[PDB]
Every structure is written in C-alpha cells, then in structure tokens.
C-alpha cells in the first residue's frame, strides 16, 4: 500500500479520540493548577516547587535536577502503566512551570547559540511526549506565569504553535473563570471543528473534562 | 561433526568454570569459550591438563560422528526494503525505521555420508514476518518454501545425537543472521537517537533471524 | 517498582497531613508576630530584633550573623528533637524578617551577579527547610514589611510561588483581622481543595491553627 | 597466618604506646601501625629494640599457625543499581542517592593444610539489605547463599586462635568493602552538597560492607 508506506492517514478517524494538549497561563493566585488537577486523575511533574496541597487526588513527582527530568520522561511509559496497575487513574501529565524548564535546560547547557540549544531541548521534549501521547491516551498540560505567557519568543512560538488550547485564567462572591475568548489585550485560542460551535468561551469553576467535552461535543 | 564435552562433564561433577580455571591454570575467558563450541582451535596442553584433572580419557572429551553437512548461500538474493519513517528516532522500534516487502533466496545443503557418496538437497527460504521476542528486541522469521521435496534431509538431521544437533542448528542460524543483517544494513541509512546512543545500524546488527521449518525442530 | 523508582507518589495521601507554609506581610504595629506565636507553640528565629515580648510562651533564638543563621538551620533537626524532649511544643518555625535575610546574605556575598547569588541563597534555604518540613511535621512561617511585601522581585517571585498561604494583616472599637480575600490593590492567596470552600476569607483575632482548620476542614 | 603480639604484651605490662616510642626511639606512628597488624614489613632493628626492652624472646613477639587461607573474587560480578534521586544533595543519606536492586558474585577460598594437600570451597555471596549503623553512616550487608555445602570450611576457621581469627575476619571484610565500593562508585555519578563539602563518591568509599554468615561468627 503506497498510502501506508507514506504517513498519509484519514482525519475523521484521527480527530475522533485525539488527546489535546492544554497550555494555561493564569498569572498568580488564580486556580490554573486547581483546574489541571480538579479531575483528581492527574500526574504532576512539579519543578523545584510543591503545589500539590490544592489537588483533591492523583499522582505527583518532585523534579530537582535536569538529569532527574530526563529520567522521568524516558521512563514515563513504564511509570504510567504501573499507576494504572496500582489502580491510580492518570489521564493527564502536567509540567508545573515552563520557566523552570528554561532554568534547568540552561544549567545543563552551561549566548544565542546557548538560547537556540535551549529551544532545541524544549522542541525535542514535546515531540517525544507527543508520540507517547497518542500511544498511552494521556492529555498533556503545561502551565506558566503571566509576565502573554512570560518567556523568550523562540520558546513561546514553539509552545503556542504546538498547543491545541491556550487559555488565560483570571478571577472576576468572587467568580473564577477561564476566558479563551479572542482579544487583542491577551492571546487565547481554542481548536474545534467547523460543525462544533462554542456558545460560551468563558468557563467558571473549569476542569480539563469540561474543556474536552466542549471541544468534542456541542457547547 | 565434532564438539568438546567439557560443559556436560563439569555439570555432572558440579565443578564451576571459575574454580577449574584457577587449578588447571587456564584463563577463565578461554575455558568459557571452549566450554561452548565457539572456539575453532584447542591447544594440546589444554586437552591434557583437563583430562588429568577430571580423570577422563581423551575419548570422553570429544564426541564424533562421521556425518558432515555443508551450507552455501546465494551470492545474488532478491530483496525489497521500504523505509517506514514514522519518527523511529524517538522510540527504538526497528519496525518504524524500515519494512521488508519480500526477501527470498536459496541455501544449497550437501549431506555427505560416511561413504564417499554424497546427497544434494536445495532449500528455498522466504521472509514471513518480524516477531517481537521482547519490547526492545525483535527476531526476523524466515520459512522454507519447499519442504516436501526435501523431506529426506530431515531423516539425516535427526539421526545425530542431541548435542551435535543443537550445535548444527546454532551454525545454520548464526550464518543466516549475518547474511540477512549485512544485506539490510547496506540498503537502509542509519538514524541516531535524540537522547549510550544506539544508531539504527547497531540495532540491525544486534537483531537475530531464526529459520522456522519442519526439517529443523530444535 | 518503576513507580517507586521515580519520586511519583499519590496525592490524596500527600495532602492529608501536609504542613503548609505561611507568608504574612503587614504594615507597622499590625500585630503580625502575635498571629504567628498566638498558638504559644512556636520557635522564633528573630534576626537582629527582639519582638518575643508579645509572645506568652515558646522558644526564641536571636540570629546575629549569617554564619549563626547557617548553623541553626543545619542543626535545626537536632534542635527540634531536644525542645520536644524538654517538653516544649514546637509546631512552627518562624523567620521574623525576609528583608534582614536579604541584608545578611548580601554581607556574606560582599551587581546583578551579586543579586542572583542572593536569590540563589534564598531559594536554597526554602528547599532545605521543606525536606525537613515533611520529616519533622513543622509548619514554616516567614514575615516581612509592607512597602505587596517589600523586596526585589526575584525574591518576591520565589517566596510567593513556594508559599501556600499569603495573607496581609491590617487593623480595621479597632479590630485586628487578616484579609486573604482576592483584590487588585493587595495580593493574597489561600490554597484549599475544590471540595473545601472558605465562606469567610477574613479572620479576626487569627491564629495559625484557625487558618490550618479552615484550609483542611470546611470554613 | 602470622601476627605481631605487641598490642597484647604492652596491655599486660600496662606500658602506654607513647612511653615505649619515646624510649625505643621508634616513631609513634610506625609503632601504632605495627601495634595493629596493618604493616606489611618489620625492620630487624624494631624486633631487637622491643625484645630487649620488654625482656621478651623473639618467639613471644610472633604467633604462628601452619594454616593458610586464600580468597579470589570474580572478575565479572552481576550488579544492578537504580538511581533514587529524592534530593540526596540536601541530606547526606546514601539511600536517597542510589539503591542496589541485586549484587551477587562468587568468592573462591582454598584452605591449604599443613600437609601439601589443599581443600577447595566455593562461596556464593548476594546482597540482602543496607543497615544503618548510625544516622550519618550505613553498612551494606551481604549474606552467603550456599552455606550447607561449605560447612567444612567453618571447622577449619574456628580451629585458629582468637587473635588469628580476628585478623582473618578483618582481611576478608577489608577486601569485600573495597570490591563492592569500587564497583558502585563507577556506575553512580557524584553529587556535591549545597552547604568541608562531602561528594557522593567520597561517602560511598567511606561506606563499609561486612559479610553476615554462619561460617564467620566474629
Ligand atoms: N474555580 C475556582 N473557584 C473558586 N476559587 C478558586 C477557583 N480556582 C481557584 N480558586 C482559588 O484559588 C486557590 C488556588 O489557587 P492556585 O490554583 O494555587 O492558583 P494558580 O494561579 O494556579 O497558582 P499560583 O501558584 O498562585 S501562580 C483556591 O484555593 C481558591 O482560593
Ligand atoms: N470561520 C471561523 N468562524 C469562527 N471561528 C473560527 C473560524 N475559523 C477559525 N475559528 C476559530 O479558530 C479556531 C481554529 O484556529 P486555527 O485554524 O487553528 O488558527 P490558525 O491561525 O489557522 O492556526 P495557528 O496555529 O493558530 S497560527 C476555531 O476552533 C475557532 O475557535
């Protein structure tokens, strides 16, 4: 089959159960982490930080070194299967901070040559995670701090391009809502098929499931 | 056909290679290789030291059978290999790197009897599938196309003792694995992994191919 | 166990008895130290100051030099064991002033290179204290002076990110109340699980226990 | 087997090491090393000065026994070590830095009798657990797998005098600790502490491993 010999594949079947990636930049003290772990079915790879206190339930692993980070990503297939074995439910793998990934990769490589290598490390990680993402049915989510998400463009470009849904989480008693509605002031994008229509792009008390259901089924 | 019987003798007595080597003053690596039938030559000194140490006559050390087999592989095989792409670089699964559409060739075997008379049998072997022995390793499986015409070859093979038969099967497989692996490595270019490093060619050479056929049952 | 090989651990069990860190920034004479030591079960590592008079009971250790500071932190495990052996109850370790930590670390290192090293010292301290924090079941609390808490962002960023609860204490007869309700004018954040709801984010006559109970059990 | 008896003789007479060194004009460090059986060579001058000083014949200074033991460790051991991470850098607890999944190997012992005849015993030793002797220090514990086949070795060991037996046990342990420590240091990379500095490799070398088995009871 010349079709099979090349990578050509049908879209209707590919978009049916696809696991979307989610990037959430919620500034400070808003609930973007709560959002990621609200489902209580999450594995949090936090970096030099411990924000697991907010999560109701799930799995978690402190990352203290770039070497430690490389090991967990390489053995991630083996790890996820056993949590499912122990009976723990993992549907999403979360990296707590993109800025810390910049800091750790920089230490490993320690100029624009250095910055380009740092970008190369970041792009390589996403490609590796994605091939496993299709294999193990795990949603990926990365979170960062407002300062658009704060970082150097080469990274921002790569993150925004690859990310399916990019959202900004803000608090408006007080109501906490995730607003992905288009806007010049802040940049957001949700990907849905032509037939699917999002009547409301702001979600109050949001969870990864609710977003998934909105992007697969009618809002 | 001839093989050393050191591995069996030591097992019945229960002496380990590590100790025997210390006493007979023969380096462990050489004694281990000679324990297997891998070595091609044996030094007269080794035959006497061991024979005096285990109170075994030279007769016991060697097993002999007048039969003798020869295998020749076609210089020109028919092979078609299609690159699969699919980002093999991330996960080291050979299947992603390349796929064999069809690889078929002939192996000529001459079973020389104890008498001068010899019999000629011609085997045609083709690719069937690539089995996954373990998650990280695979074994290409090749099946003989014509077996009914070469049923007589089987009668000569099973006549050998079990130890000789296991040796012969290792020899036919080692050659096959070298033949197929060498052909593939040339047609497909190497791919180095992003994250020590295992290039595609190294993985292909490591891969082993074992013939699956009625004639050979072990 | 591939799960155990890596640091991956369950969350429901991790958030059950977690000892939260508390950062309380206040203006002058707002009784911020009273709150931290009201429980009368506290060890105060005051820096070049003596505010133990407001406290009724507990153990206080004056810190006069960066070298003295390093020693107490390194031997802190051994110390906690002895005060508990004497029967003194220590549940919280308090550093009186973050600005003094900036001043002392600066003397030890005496440019942006100097500032980055000062940030490196501050981040390292928290990581060290945290691993002991899980081991010895001690709540950590740091306090500073309003001028948001006054400091250089690199420090502020690290403190706010790591701190579980950040609160501002103000006096409003006059009443002393800690307000962590969200607000553009002042920044506050309390971390609680989705099921837990804080009906009232302002606490009058507050103590560390009351906050702990509010963040574990229903307000 | 042979050891100096200086430590016992001085204790009975009650003389301190410092006074003896000042009188016999031998440097304290050398006399202390020789008090232990650590030194390999002894100068004839030392044997006479001490023997004249303590009115002891040369016979008394040395204890001898015709028995002689030899120990050989496998060149190729089977070892699996898994990095544990968990921020060892903060608290110096080796367990956090690395964990041994399984380390097993063989030690070959030859008990040569007074007569030319020698007996060969083969010991297989495996990892069991890492005991914590003190909060800052640990001792890897290894247990002999097969002891029933090598019961006879024990009969030869306890036949020695207590002083010789304590010496032999030190020799078997010192070698084991060097062997296991050297293997681990290569597989695991060093980690330097944040807060003089104690790198992981230095801690691993300091760590000592003591064999726990019925054969050796002291
Ligand atoms: N959907 C929500 N409804 C009401 N309050 C919420 C909601 N999400 C978050 N909060 C509040 O915010 C707290 C959690 O904030 P976090 O999730 O830690 O904020 P974040 O922005 O993800 O993280 P940092 O560390 O503050 S940048 C909760 O305990 C609530 O006080
Ligand atoms: N014709 C349209 N009407 C309404 N919304 C639309 C329309 N086209 C796109 N959108 C919105 O934009 C989403 C798709 O954006 P994309 O097609 O991915 O944008 P793009 O600019 O082509 O690609 P990048 O990756 O963002 S540069 C949809 O899910 C809608 O939210």
Query: What does the H/E/C string look like for chain A?
Result: CHHHHCCCCCHHHHCCCCCCEEEEECCCCCCHHHHHHCCCCEEEECECCCCCCCCCCCEECCECCHHHHHHHHHCHHHHHHHHHHHCCCCCEEEECCHHHHHHHHHHHHCCHHHHHHHHHHHHHHHHHHHHHHHHHCCEEEEEECECCECCCHHHHHHHHHHCCEEEEEEECCCCEEEECCCCCCCCCECCCCCCCCCCCCEEECCCHHHHHHHHHCCC
Smallest Cβ–Cβ distance between B85 and the set A7, A70, A124 belongs to A7
Residues present in chain B in total: 218
Distance from CA of B165 to the nearest CA of D (A): 31
Cβ contacts of C10 within 8 Å, gap of 6 or more = A57, A58, A59, A60, A88
Q: How far is D85 from chain A (nearest CA, A)?
A: 7
* C-alpha triplet D137, D140, D143: angle, nearest 5°: 150
D90 DSSP assignment: T
Residues sharing a CB contact under 8 Å with residue B78, sequence separation 6 or more, in sequence order: B102, B103, B104, B105
Contact C104, C66 (CB under 8 A): yes
Residue closest to C189 by CA, chosen among A174, A29, A25:
A29
Signed CA dihedral, C131, C134, C138, C142: sign only: positive
How far, in Å, CA of A38 to CA of A208, rounded?
Answer: 8
> Which of B108, B81, B96 is closest to B181 using CA atoms?
B81
The sign of the dihedral angle between the CA atoms of D164, D169, D174, D175 is positive
**DSSP string spanning B64-98?**
E-S-EEEEEE-SS-EEEEEE--TTTTTS--HHHHE
* Interchain pair A128, B194: CB under 8 A: yes
Please name the helix (run of DSSP H) or strand (run of DSSP E) that holds residue D61, with its range, or none. helix D58-61
Q: ∠C167-C172-C175 over CA atoms, to 5°?
A: 95
Using an 8 Å Cβ cutoff, are B209 and B141 in contact? yes
Whether the CB-CB separation of D78 and D104 falls below 8 Å is answered with yes
Spatial separation of the C-alpha atoms in residues B124 and B129, rounded to whole Å = 16
User: CA A97 to CA A46: how far, in whole Å?
Assistant: 7
Q: If you measure from the C-alpha of residue A191 to the centroid of ligand 2, how many angstroms do you get, rounded to a whole number? A: 7
B209 CB burial (10 A radius; 0-12, 13-18, 19+): buried
CB–CB of A208/A139 below 8 Å? Answer: yes
Phi, psi (degrees; rounded to nearest 5) at C29: 60, 35
- The CA-based dihedral angle spanning residues A17, A21, A27, A31, taken in that order and rounded to the nearest 10 degrees: 40
Q: How far apart are CA A198 and CA A217, in angstroms?
A: 9
B9 phi, psi to nearest 5 deg: -60, -50
Alpha carbon separation from C25 to A171, C37, C60, C150, D183 (Å, rounded): 22, 15, 20, 9, 53
Whole-Å CA distances, B96 to B66, B104, B106, B191, D38: 47, 22, 28, 11, 61
The answer to whether residues A32 and A24 touch, using CB atoms and an 8 Å cutoff, is yes
Sequence-distant (6+) residues with CB within 8 A of B58 are B47, B51
Q: What is the resolution of this structure in A?
A: 3.3
Which residues of chain D lie closer than 8 angstroms to C74, CB-CB?
Answer: 195
Radius of gyration (Cα) for chain C, nearest Å?
Answer: 18
Note the Cα C116 to chain centre separation in Å.
22
DSSP assigned state of D189: P
Q: Which residues pair with B81 in a beta bridge?
A: B100
Crossing angle of helices C153-162 and C98-109, rounded to 10°: 130
Under 8 Å between Cβ of A49 and A60 = no
C52: left (phi over 0), alpha (psi -120 to 50) or beta: alpha
Chains C and A touch (3+ CB pairs under 8 A): yes
Cα distances from A98 to residues A48, A124, A142, A160, in angstroms, run 12, 14, 7, 12
Residue B205, phi then psi, degrees to nearest 5 = -65, -40
Pairing of strands A92-95, A42-45: parallel
Query: What are the distances in angstroms from CA B26 to CA B14, B32, B45, B204?
Result: 18, 10, 10, 35
Q: Could you tell me which chain B residue has the CA closest to the CA of A8?
A: B86
* Positive/negative CA dihedral, B52, B57, B62, B63: negative
3-state class (DSSP) for residue C84: helix
Whether the CA torsion D76, D82, D83, D88 is positive or negative: it is: negative
Closest CA to D180 of D100, D71, D82: D100
Cβ partners under 8 Å of residue C215, min gap 6: C20, C164, C165, C190, C191, C192, C196, C198
Q: At what angle do helices A153-162 and A98-109 cross, to 10 degrees?
A: 130
Beta bridge partners of B71: B109
Phi-psi map region of D167: left, alpha, beta (phi>0 left; psi -120 to 50 alpha): alpha
Nearest CA to ligand 1 atom 9: A31
**Cβ B87–A5 below 8 Å, yes or no?**
no
Query: What distances in angstroms separate CA C166 from CA B210, C65, C152, one per listed residue?
Result: 67, 27, 17
Name the DSSP letter for residue D17.
H
Helix, strand, coil percentages in chain C from 3-state DSSP, rounded to 5: 40, 20, 40
Task: Inspect the interface and report whether the beta carbons of C8 and A38 lie closer than 8 Å.
Answer: no
Q: What is chain A's length? A: 219
Q: Which residues of D35-53 are buried (b: 16+ CB within 10 A; e: fewer)?
A: bebeeeeeeeebeebbeee
- CB proximity list for B199: less than 8 A, separation 6 or greater: B190, B191, B192, B193
How many whole angstroms from C32 Cα to the centroid of ligand 2? 51
Residue C8: exposure state from Cβ atoms within 10 A (0-12, 13-18, ≥19): buried
Gap between the Cα atoms of C121 and C102, Å rounded: 9
Contacts of D172 (CB under 8 A, 6+ apart): D71, D211, D216
Distance CA A96, CA A58 (A): 14
Q: Is C94 helix (H, G, I), strand (E, B) or coil?
A: strand
Q: Which of A120, A151, A113, A142 is nearest to A20 (CA)?
A: A142
Which run of H or of E encompasses D13?
helix D6-13
Whole-angstrom distance, CA of residue A55 vs CA of residue A38: 6
C88-107 residues labelled b (16+ CB within 10 A) or e (exposed)? eebbbbbbbbbebbbebbee
Give the chain D residue whose CA is nearest to the CA of B23: D120
CA distance A159 to A122: 9
What part of B 5-44 touches D (C-beta under 8 Å)?
16, 18-19, 22-23, 28
Rounded to an integer, what distance in angstroms lies between the CA atom of residue B19 and that of residue B54?
13
- The answer, yes or no, to whether B and D have at least 3 beta-carbon pairs within 8 Å is yes
Radius of gyration of chain A (CA): 18
Q: Whole-angstrom Cα distance, residue D180 to residue D201?
A: 13
Closest CA to A205 of A177, A174, A171, A173: A177
Give the CA dihedral D171, D174, D178, D179, nearest 10 degrees.
Answer: 50
Under 8 Å CB-to-CB from A207, ≥6 apart: which residues? A35, A38, A39
What is the Cα–Cα distance from B197 to C20, expressed in whole angstroms?
Answer: 43
Dist. CA C212–CA A161, nearest whole Å: 42
Helix axes B17-24, B44-53, angle to 10 degrees: 110
What span, in angstroms and rounded, lies between the C-alpha atoms of D216 and D125? 13
d(CA C43, CA B217): 78
Backbone angles phi, psi at D152, to 5 degrees: -60, -35
Q: Which residues, other chains included, contact B10 with Cβ-Cβ below 8 Å and sequence gap of 6+?
A: B16, B17, B20, B35, B54
Alpha-carbon dihedral angle through residues D175, D178, D181, D183, given to the nearest 10 degrees: -90
Taking alpha carbons only, the member of A192, A191, A143, A188 closest to residue A168 is A188
Give the alpha-carbon dihedral of B107, B112, B118, B123, to 10 degrees.
-20
Q: What whole-number distance in Å separates Cα of residue D162 and Cα of residue D170?
A: 13
Q: Are B80 and B101 in contact (CB under 8 A)?
A: yes
Residues 6+ positions from A72 with CB-CB distance below 8 Å: A45, A61, A63, A79, C6, C7, C8
d(CA D143, CA A159) in angstroms, rounded, equals 54
Angle at D7 between CA D4 and CA D12, to 5 degrees: 125
The helix (run of H) or strand (run of E) holding residue D98 is strand D98-112
Distance separating alpha carbons of residues C28 and C171, to the nearest angstrom: 10
Q: How far apart are CA A32 and CA A42, in angstroms?
A: 14
Distance of alpha carbon B74 from its chain centroid, rounded? Answer: 18
What span, in angstroms and rounded, lies between the C-alpha atoms of D67 and D62?
15
What is the whole-number distance in angstroms between the Cα of residue A146 and the centre of ligand 1?
15
Region for residue B137 given its phi and psi (left: phi exceeds 0; alpha: psi -120 to 50; beta: otherwise): beta
> What is the separation of C-alpha D107 from the centre of its chain, rounded to a whole number of angstroms?
15
Q: Which atom of ligand 2 is nearest to the CA of A161?
A: 25
Q: Which of A217, A218, A215, A157 is nearest to A187 (CA)?
A: A157
**8 Å CB contact between D128 and D143:** yes
Q: Residue C124 CA to chain centroid, in angstroms? A: 15
Cβ contact D184:D71 at 8 Å: no
- Of B125, B141, B121, the closest CA to residue B133 belongs to B141
Experimental method reported for this structure: cryo-EM
Distances in Å between the alpha carbon of B9 and those of B38, B59, C103?
Answer: 17, 13, 79
Q: Which residues contact D80 (CB under 8 A, 6 or more apart)?
A: D100, D101, D102, D103
Q: Count other C-beta atoms under 10 Å from residue D85's C-beta.
A: 22
Q: Are D162 and D120 in contact (CB under 8 A)?
A: no
What distance in Å separates the CA atoms of residue A42 and residue A138, rounded to the nearest whole number?
A: 10
Of the candidates A214, A210, A203, A207, which has an alpha carbon nearest to the alpha carbon of residue A33? A207
Name every chain D residue with its beta carbon within 8 A of the beta carbon of C70.
195
E strand or H helix that includes residue C176: strand C176-179
Backbone φ and ψ of D49, nearest 5°: -55, -50
CB C94 within 8 A of CB C78: no
The β-bridge partners of B3 are B63
């Amino acid at each position: 089959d010349i079709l099979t010999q090349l990578g050509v594949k049908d879209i209707s079947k590919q978009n049916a159960n696809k696991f979307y990636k989610f990037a959430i930049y919620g500034k400070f003290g808003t609930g973007k982490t709560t959002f990621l772990t609200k489902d209580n079915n999450a594995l949090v790879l936090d970096i030099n930080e411990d924000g697991t206190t907010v999560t109701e339930d799930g799995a978690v692993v402190q990352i203290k070194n770039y070497k430690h980070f490389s090991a967990v990503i390489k053995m991630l297939p083996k790890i996820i299967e056993q949590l499912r074995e122990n009976g723990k439910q993992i549907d999403v793998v979360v990296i707590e901070t993109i800025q810390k990934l910049r800091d750790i990769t920089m230490d490993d490589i320690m100029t624009f040559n250095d910055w380009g290598e740092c970008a190369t490390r970041i792009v390589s990680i996403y490609r590796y995670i994605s091939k496993l993402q299709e294999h193990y049915q795990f949603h990926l989510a990365i979170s960062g701090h407002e300062g658009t998400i704060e970082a150097q463009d080469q990274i921002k470009k790569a993150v925004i391009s690859q990310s399916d849904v990019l959202a900004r989480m803000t608090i408006e008693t007080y109501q906490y809502v995730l607003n992905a509605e288009p806007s010049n002031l802040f940049e957001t994008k949700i990907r849905h098929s032509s037939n699917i229509k999002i009547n409301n792009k702001r979600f109050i008390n949001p969870s990864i499931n609710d977003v998934v259901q909105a992007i697969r089924n009618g809002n | 056909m001839i093989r050393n019987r050191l591995s069996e003798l030591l097992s019945e007595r229960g002496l380990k290679i590590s100790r025997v080597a210390k006493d007979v003053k023969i380096a462990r690596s050489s004694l281990t290789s000679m324990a297997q039938n891998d070595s091609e030559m044996i030094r007269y000194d080794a035959i006497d030291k061991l024979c005096s140490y285990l109170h075994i006559s030279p007769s016991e050390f060697f097993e002999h059978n007048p039969i003798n087999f020869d295998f020749t592989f076609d210089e020109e095989p028919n092979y078609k290999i299609n690159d699969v792409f699919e980002g093999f670089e991330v996960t080291a699964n050979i299947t992603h790197a390349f796929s064999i559409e069809n690889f078929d060739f002939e192996i000529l075997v001459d079973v020389e009897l104890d008498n001068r008379q010899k019999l000629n049998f011609d085997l045609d072997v083709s690719y069937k599938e690539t089995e996954k022995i373990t998650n990280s390793q695979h074994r290409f499986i090749f099946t003989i196309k014509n077996e009914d015409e070469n049923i007589g070859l089987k009668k000569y093979v099973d006549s050998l003792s079990a130890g000789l038969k296991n040796l012969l099967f290792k020899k036919i497989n080692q050659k096959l694995s070298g033949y197929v692996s060498e052909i593939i490595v040339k047609n497909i270019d190497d791919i180095e992994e992003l994250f020590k490093s295992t290039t595609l060619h190294k993985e292909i050479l490591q891969t082993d191919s074992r013939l699956s056929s009625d004639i050979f049952k072990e």
